[PDB]
Amino acid sequence: LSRLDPPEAEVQIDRLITGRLQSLQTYVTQQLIRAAEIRASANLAATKM
Amino acid sequence: STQDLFLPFFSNVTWFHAIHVTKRFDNPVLPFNDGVYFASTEKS
Amino acid sequence: GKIQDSLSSALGKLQDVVNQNAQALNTLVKQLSSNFGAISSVLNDI
Amino acid sequence: VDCTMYICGDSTECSNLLLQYGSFCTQLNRALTGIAVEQDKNTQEVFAQ
Secondary structure, X not given: OOOOOOOOOHHHHXXXXXXXXXXXXXXXXXXXXXXXXXXXXXXXXXXXX | OOOOOOOOOOOOOOOOOOOOOOOXXXXXXXXXXXXXXXXXXXXX | OOOOOOOOXXXXXXXXXXXXXXXXXXXXXXOOOOXXXXXXXXXXXX | OOHHHHXXXXXXXXXXXXXXXXXXXXXXXXXXXXXXXXXXXXXXOOOOO
16 A cells, blocks of 8 residues: 555555465365364264264 | 445434425535435425 | 155255255356456456 | 455455455355354264264
8 A cells, every 4th residue: 555556556456365365265175174074073973972 | 245335224314304385494515425315305 | 654644745864955055056156256356357357 | 254354454445356256255254154053063963962
């Protein structure tokens, strides 16, 4: 916002969005693989229970 | 869902008039906020 | 007898997925017609 | 994850670059909070017999 001009430096925002969107995209992903992997372990856990 | 400036559900608004068919005449300078909700109700 | 009339029209393991593919096949219209943080969401304008 | 404050944080124009733009972090929530109810349900039948 400060150092350069907002009708041109939104391009400097524009790329900064997407890797953060990607890192969120990975984190939802890499959680989700382990996520229902726990339930797949947990259904075994409740069955022994 | 989107993002638009809607009007609140049963929004607090202000009860003006132009009624004489006495002595009530209203036309004030009024500001320009986040989307206007103006209505002009008449019969005449 | 007793279970021929409560068979006749939320079940065992067959109610599950078609809630959710119904949920999720909405989503595949929406995933890439979402953000991706560019000037526009379809690549040729980029 | 509260999405926009992870991506941008407290900024109008960064959010206003994020809205040509459908429902990513909407569905990222509905990804994540979708799993979030289930571990409690995984906690449910693993003891409450």
